[PDB]
Amino acid sequence: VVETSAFGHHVQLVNREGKAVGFIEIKESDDEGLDIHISANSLRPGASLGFHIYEKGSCVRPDFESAGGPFNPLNKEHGFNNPMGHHAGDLPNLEVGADGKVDVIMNAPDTSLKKGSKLNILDEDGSAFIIHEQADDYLTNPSGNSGARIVCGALLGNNEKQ
């Protein structure tokens, strides 16, 4: 009939235009690196639905103490090979095209998300996942965007003591 997720409490990845409405379904395992199922869904356009750890707190920081986010200025050109050039700041491997079925669970640096605390990989910005600044929804007419903060999902664990 219907199914259900595993664990709870996660950073939902939704977009005002992306249409995405998945979530960060992490299911700590016990093998190597990680074995979570962080992949959004409910999309269509070749837009993005989040980004790599590059945000300060999940919708809990305006702009003052180290903005963070991506790098480089606006720069809205993107040319496979132009005289101007472009870089932006790298793009996440999750820009629709497969139902946002992008689950990273193969070879990891140090994703000890099975230590016994969801994701004990709290380093500067644990796991940040901002769902914005990307879209490229070829619509222009309704209410697309192609760059604008609306959703987020940066849940960077916090820990500190003497």
mmCIF file of C-alpha atoms in Angstrom:
data_model
loop_
_atom_site.group_PDB
_atom_site.id
_atom_site.type_symbol
_atom_site.label_atom_id
_atom_site.label_comp_id
_atom_site.label_asym_id
_atom_site.label_seq_id
_atom_site.Cartn_x
_atom_site.Cartn_y
_atom_site.Cartn_z
ATOM 1 C CA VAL A 1 0.000 0.000 0.000
ATOM 2 C CA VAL A 2 2.319 2.689 1.312
ATOM 3 C CA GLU A 3 5.825 2.877 2.725
ATOM 4 C CA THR A 4 7.624 4.886 5.381
ATOM 5 C CA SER A 5 11.085 6.264 6.053
ATOM 6 C CA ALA A 6 13.508 4.906 8.624
ATOM 7 C CA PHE A 7 14.883 7.513 10.999
ATOM 8 C CA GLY A 8 13.362 10.900 11.735
ATOM 9 C CA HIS A 9 14.492 14.465 12.321
ATOM 10 C CA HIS A 10 16.223 15.533 9.129
ATOM 11 C CA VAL A 11 16.762 18.562 6.923
ATOM 12 C CA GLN A 12 13.976 18.564 4.362
ATOM 13 C CA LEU A 13 15.088 19.560 0.883
ATOM 14 C CA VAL A 14 12.328 21.479 -0.857
ATOM 15 C CA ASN A 15 12.327 24.217 -3.470
ATOM 16 C CA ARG A 16 9.778 26.912 -4.226
ATOM 17 C CA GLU A 17 10.203 26.072 -7.892
ATOM 18 C CA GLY A 18 12.337 22.945 -7.877
ATOM 19 C CA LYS A 19 9.229 21.129 -6.706
ATOM 20 C CA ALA A 20 11.513 18.945 -4.622
ATOM 21 C CA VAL A 21 10.000 17.813 -1.342
ATOM 22 C CA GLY A 22 12.224 14.920 -0.336
ATOM 23 C CA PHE A 23 14.375 14.911 2.779
ATOM 24 C CA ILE A 24 17.713 13.933 4.271
ATOM 25 C CA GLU A 25 16.967 10.326 5.141
ATOM 26 C CA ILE A 26 20.119 9.198 6.909
ATOM 27 C CA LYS A 27 20.279 5.586 8.026
ATOM 28 C CA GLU A 28 23.652 5.152 9.687
ATOM 29 C CA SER A 29 25.147 1.797 8.772
ATOM 30 C CA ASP A 30 28.279 -0.126 9.681
ATOM 31 C CA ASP A 31 30.756 -0.723 6.884
ATOM 32 C CA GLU A 32 32.760 2.198 5.548
ATOM 33 C CA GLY A 33 32.503 5.945 5.086
ATOM 34 C CA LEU A 34 28.738 6.323 5.173
ATOM 35 C CA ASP A 35 25.576 4.582 4.037
ATOM 36 C CA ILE A 36 22.888 7.226 4.367
ATOM 37 C CA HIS A 37 20.156 7.942 1.848
ATOM 38 C CA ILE A 38 20.473 11.682 1.357
ATOM 39 C CA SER A 39 18.516 12.218 -1.838
ATOM 40 C CA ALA A 40 15.600 14.517 -2.569
ATOM 41 C CA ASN A 41 12.753 13.794 -4.956
ATOM 42 C CA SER A 42 9.568 15.217 -6.423
ATOM 43 C CA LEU A 43 11.258 17.346 -9.057
ATOM 44 C CA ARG A 44 11.221 17.670 -12.829
ATOM 45 C CA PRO A 45 13.399 20.553 -14.036
ATOM 46 C CA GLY A 46 17.178 20.378 -14.169
ATOM 47 C CA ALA A 47 17.372 22.499 -11.040
ATOM 48 C CA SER A 48 19.326 21.902 -7.854
ATOM 49 C CA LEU A 49 17.950 20.769 -4.515
ATOM 50 C CA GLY A 50 20.623 21.648 -1.983
ATOM 51 C CA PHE A 51 24.398 21.902 -1.885
ATOM 52 C CA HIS A 52 27.472 20.523 -0.160
ATOM 53 C CA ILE A 53 28.317 21.553 3.382
ATOM 54 C CA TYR A 54 28.462 25.287 2.784
ATOM 55 C CA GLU A 55 26.218 27.106 5.231
ATOM 56 C CA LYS A 56 26.129 28.289 8.825
ATOM 57 C CA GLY A 57 23.292 26.592 10.668
ATOM 58 C CA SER A 58 20.041 25.556 9.027
ATOM 59 C CA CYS A 59 18.060 28.752 8.596
ATOM 60 C CA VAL A 60 19.496 30.109 11.824
ATOM 61 C CA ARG A 61 21.921 32.714 10.535
ATOM 62 C CA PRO A 62 21.258 35.886 8.532
ATOM 63 C CA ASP A 63 24.531 37.485 7.499
ATOM 64 C CA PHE A 64 27.169 38.748 9.901
ATOM 65 C CA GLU A 65 29.355 36.087 11.474
ATOM 66 C CA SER A 66 31.077 34.608 8.445
ATOM 67 C CA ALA A 67 28.383 34.370 5.796
ATOM 68 C CA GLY A 68 29.876 31.176 4.417
ATOM 69 C CA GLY A 69 27.752 29.926 1.545
ATOM 70 C CA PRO A 70 29.530 29.522 -1.801
ATOM 71 C CA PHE A 71 32.419 31.577 -3.125
ATOM 72 C CA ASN A 72 33.175 34.071 -5.870
ATOM 73 C CA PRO A 73 30.845 36.930 -6.829
ATOM 74 C CA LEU A 74 27.533 36.643 -8.639
ATOM 75 C CA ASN A 75 29.105 35.895 -12.001
ATOM 76 C CA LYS A 76 26.149 34.622 -13.992
ATOM 77 C CA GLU A 77 27.679 33.532 -17.278
ATOM 78 C CA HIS A 78 28.760 29.905 -17.217
ATOM 79 C CA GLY A 79 30.601 29.190 -20.446
ATOM 80 C CA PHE A 80 31.921 25.750 -21.310
ATOM 81 C CA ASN A 81 34.603 27.662 -23.174
ATOM 82 C CA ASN A 82 34.272 31.421 -23.470
ATOM 83 C CA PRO A 83 36.632 34.410 -23.380
ATOM 84 C CA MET A 84 35.085 35.556 -20.120
ATOM 85 C CA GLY A 85 35.086 32.217 -18.338
ATOM 86 C CA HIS A 86 33.161 31.105 -15.275
ATOM 87 C CA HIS A 87 33.527 29.053 -12.115
ATOM 88 C CA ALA A 88 30.754 29.998 -9.720
ATOM 89 C CA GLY A 89 31.746 27.590 -6.973
ATOM 90 C CA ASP A 90 31.212 24.040 -8.171
ATOM 91 C CA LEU A 91 27.774 22.478 -8.431
ATOM 92 C CA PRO A 92 26.280 19.591 -6.444
ATOM 93 C CA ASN A 93 25.668 16.271 -8.158
ATOM 94 C CA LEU A 94 21.935 16.482 -7.568
ATOM 95 C CA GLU A 95 20.317 18.687 -10.185
ATOM 96 C CA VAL A 96 17.334 16.530 -11.066
ATOM 97 C CA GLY A 97 17.480 14.177 -14.028
ATOM 98 C CA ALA A 98 16.882 11.025 -12.020
ATOM 99 C CA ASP A 99 14.188 12.066 -9.574
ATOM 100 C CA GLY A 100 16.907 13.565 -7.409
ATOM 101 C CA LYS A 101 17.866 10.007 -6.547
ATOM 102 C CA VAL A 102 21.382 11.008 -5.565
ATOM 103 C CA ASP A 103 22.482 8.897 -2.622
ATOM 104 C CA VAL A 104 26.117 9.143 -1.599
ATOM 105 C CA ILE A 105 27.203 5.929 0.078
ATOM 106 C CA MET A 106 30.388 4.950 -1.718
ATOM 107 C CA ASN A 107 33.805 5.822 -0.345
ATOM 108 C CA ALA A 108 33.938 8.644 2.174
ATOM 109 C CA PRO A 109 36.644 10.756 3.827
ATOM 110 C CA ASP A 110 35.357 10.703 7.386
ATOM 111 C CA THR A 111 31.583 10.483 7.573
ATOM 112 C CA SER A 112 31.374 8.842 10.977
ATOM 113 C CA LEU A 113 27.606 9.202 10.896
ATOM 114 C CA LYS A 114 27.383 5.822 12.587
ATOM 115 C CA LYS A 115 29.413 6.693 15.660
ATOM 116 C CA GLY A 116 26.122 6.905 17.518
ATOM 117 C CA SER A 117 24.758 10.395 16.984
ATOM 118 C CA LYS A 118 23.284 10.651 13.507
ATOM 119 C CA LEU A 119 26.155 12.665 12.083
ATOM 120 C CA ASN A 120 29.017 13.201 14.500
ATOM 121 C CA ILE A 121 30.845 14.937 11.677
ATOM 122 C CA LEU A 122 30.492 18.385 13.198
ATOM 123 C CA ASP A 123 33.476 20.230 11.776
ATOM 124 C CA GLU A 124 33.054 23.954 11.249
ATOM 125 C CA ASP A 125 29.721 23.317 9.572
ATOM 126 C CA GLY A 126 28.807 19.693 10.170
ATOM 127 C CA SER A 127 26.530 18.965 7.236
ATOM 128 C CA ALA A 128 25.215 22.023 5.433
ATOM 129 C CA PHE A 129 22.682 21.739 2.635
ATOM 130 C CA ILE A 130 21.284 24.990 1.293
ATOM 131 C CA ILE A 131 18.565 24.503 -1.297
ATOM 132 C CA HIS A 132 18.834 27.734 -3.249
ATOM 133 C CA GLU A 133 21.029 29.839 -5.502
ATOM 134 C CA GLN A 134 20.409 27.185 -8.129
ATOM 135 C CA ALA A 135 17.545 26.250 -10.421
ATOM 136 C CA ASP A 136 17.913 27.418 -14.001
ATOM 137 C CA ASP A 137 14.217 26.740 -14.454
ATOM 138 C CA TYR A 138 13.621 27.779 -18.045
ATOM 139 C CA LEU A 139 10.219 29.303 -17.390
ATOM 140 C CA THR A 140 10.467 33.030 -16.776
ATOM 141 C CA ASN A 141 6.835 34.086 -16.661
ATOM 142 C CA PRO A 142 5.187 32.342 -13.702
ATOM 143 C CA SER A 143 7.477 32.821 -10.726
ATOM 144 C CA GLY A 144 10.699 30.892 -11.202
ATOM 145 C CA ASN A 145 13.864 32.384 -9.761
ATOM 146 C CA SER A 146 17.198 30.872 -10.725
ATOM 147 C CA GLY A 147 18.822 32.155 -7.556
ATOM 148 C CA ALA A 148 17.185 33.153 -4.293
ATOM 149 C CA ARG A 149 17.129 31.806 -0.756
ATOM 150 C CA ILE A 150 13.855 30.082 0.041
ATOM 151 C CA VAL A 151 14.667 26.681 1.493
ATOM 152 C CA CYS A 152 17.524 25.265 3.531
ATOM 153 C CA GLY A 153 18.673 22.134 5.322
ATOM 154 C CA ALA A 154 22.075 22.796 6.842
ATOM 155 C CA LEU A 155 22.096 20.852 10.089
ATOM 156 C CA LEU A 156 25.689 21.259 11.209
ATOM 157 C CA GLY A 157 25.994 19.594 14.595
ATOM 158 C CA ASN A 158 27.223 21.791 17.423
ATOM 159 C CA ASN A 159 29.497 20.811 20.285
ATOM 160 C CA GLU A 160 31.907 22.666 22.538
ATOM 161 C CA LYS A 161 33.333 22.476 26.039
ATOM 162 C CA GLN A 162 36.391 23.178 28.156
#
